[PDB]
Amino acid sequence: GSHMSWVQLGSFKAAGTSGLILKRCSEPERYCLARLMADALRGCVPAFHGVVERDGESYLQLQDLLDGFDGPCVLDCKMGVRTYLEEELTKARERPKLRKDMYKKMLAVDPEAPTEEEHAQRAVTKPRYMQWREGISSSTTLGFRIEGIKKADGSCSTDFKTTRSREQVLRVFEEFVQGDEEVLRRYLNRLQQIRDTLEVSEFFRRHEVIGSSLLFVHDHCHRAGVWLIDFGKTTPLPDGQILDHRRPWEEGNREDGYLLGLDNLIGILASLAER
Numbered sequence: 221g222s223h224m225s226w227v228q229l230g231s232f233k234a235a236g237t238s239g240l241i242l243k244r245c246s247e248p249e250r251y252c253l254a255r256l257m258a259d260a261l262r263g264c265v266p267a268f269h270g271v272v273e274r275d276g277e278s279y280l281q282l283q284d285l286l287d288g289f290d291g292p293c294v295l296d297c298k299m300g301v302r303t304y305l306e307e308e309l310t311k312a313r314e315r316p317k318l319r320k321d322m323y324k325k326m327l328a329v330d331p332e333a334p335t336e337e338e339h340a341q342r343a344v345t346k347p348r349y350m351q352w353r354e355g356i357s358s359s360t361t362l363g364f365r366i367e368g369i370k371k372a373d374g375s376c377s378t379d380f381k382t383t384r385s386r387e388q389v390l391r392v393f394e395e396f397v398q399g400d401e402e403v404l405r406r407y408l409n410r411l412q413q414i415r416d417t418l419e420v421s422e423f424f425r426r427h428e429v430i431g432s433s434l435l436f437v438h439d440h441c442h443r444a445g446v447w448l449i450d451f452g453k454t455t456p457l458p459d460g461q462i463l464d465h466r467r468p469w470e471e472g473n474r475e476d477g478y479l480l481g482l483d484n485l486i487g488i489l490a491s492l493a494e495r
């Protein structure tokens with residue numbers, strides 16, 4: 221029905237207009253959503269209606285993706301082999317900010333993961349933490365990871381930090397769709413059409429897409445949709461330079477593995493459909 225309904229039961233606020241939601245404005249994301257409304261990917265992203273002022277702060281006015289659903293189930297999938305900008309590697313070499321928060325979450329999952337010096341510091345750099353997170357999840361090997369589920373029973377979970385194997389990922393989607401063959405068929409048709417759109421998009425060949433998600437939404441009436449969201453770390457390549465979005469990332473090449481991820485995700489859902 222609406223996201224703010226679920227919120228009530230960080231960057232999001234309720235809109236006055238029915239079927240809309242407000243997200244805190246960031247300049248990279250505003251730039252991206254403006255370009256996307258004129259791109260092949262227009263129908264694969266939430267409608268962007270412009271910027272509004274609320275309590276002396278700027279908000280993006282977005283389509284509420286939950287509006288058309290009756291008690292929506294939601295799964296957020298972070299896309300890419302890399303989840304941080306290359307500039308973070310330069311900042312950590314020249315002038316590191318030590319993160320005590322990030323050391324604690326590391327310790328919790330694997331006490332043996334931090335180095336002798338990190339244990340002494342009780343702190344790690346951002347790129348070190350994010351690379352570790354990529355390696356214990358499916359990010360490094362499959363090019364995507366499950367971040368969270370919000371269920372129609374009001375229950376939610378973010379307990380997926382060690383979901384890594386192809387079969388572990390398949391079991392999360394198996395539980396999410398609860399044997400609804402129509403929802404799974406509609407998700408697979410939508411992902412195939414999104415892949416075709418990405419492969420011809422003028423926006424996609426010219427931009428590094430880091431930290432974006434695919435948002436899966438379905439309901440008990442068998443309605444099913446998928447959209448790209450979160451363009452806060454999506455940046456244009458210099459000159460007339462393009463990415464293939466499949467080849468491995470090496471510092472300098474700005475590759476994101478986005479389509480390696482989408483290829484693997486379609487393969488897993490196609491496998492699940494034949495079980």
Ligand SMILES: Nc1ncnc2c1ncn2[C@@H]1O[C@H](COP(=O)(O)OP(=O)(O)OP(=O)(O)O)[C@@H](O)[C@H]1O
Pocket residue numbers: 223230231232241266282283284285286294296433435449450452
């Ligand atoms: N247009 C939308 N309509 C409905 N729900 C949305 C919409 N955009 C985002 N959401 C919800 O908000 C969540 C967070 O979205 P998003 O990733 O854009 O935010 P964020 O604050 O940048 O988070 P992060 O950067 O940590 O991933 C999504 O997983 C989804 O549940």
Ligand SMILES: O=P(O)(O)OC[C@@H]1O[C@H](CO)[C@@H](OP(=O)(O)O)[C@H](OP(=O)(O)O)[C@H]1O
Pocket residue numbers: 303304346353431452453
């Ligand atoms: O491992 P998780 O699930 O707990 O997520 C950790 C958080 O992942 C965010 C991305 O989703 C980062 O944000 P940006 O990438 O927009 O910069 C946060 O970074 P900062 O703390 O530096 O803002 C980081 O703490």
Ligand SMILES: [Mn+2]
Pocket residue numbers: 431432433450
């Ligand atoms: Mn996000």
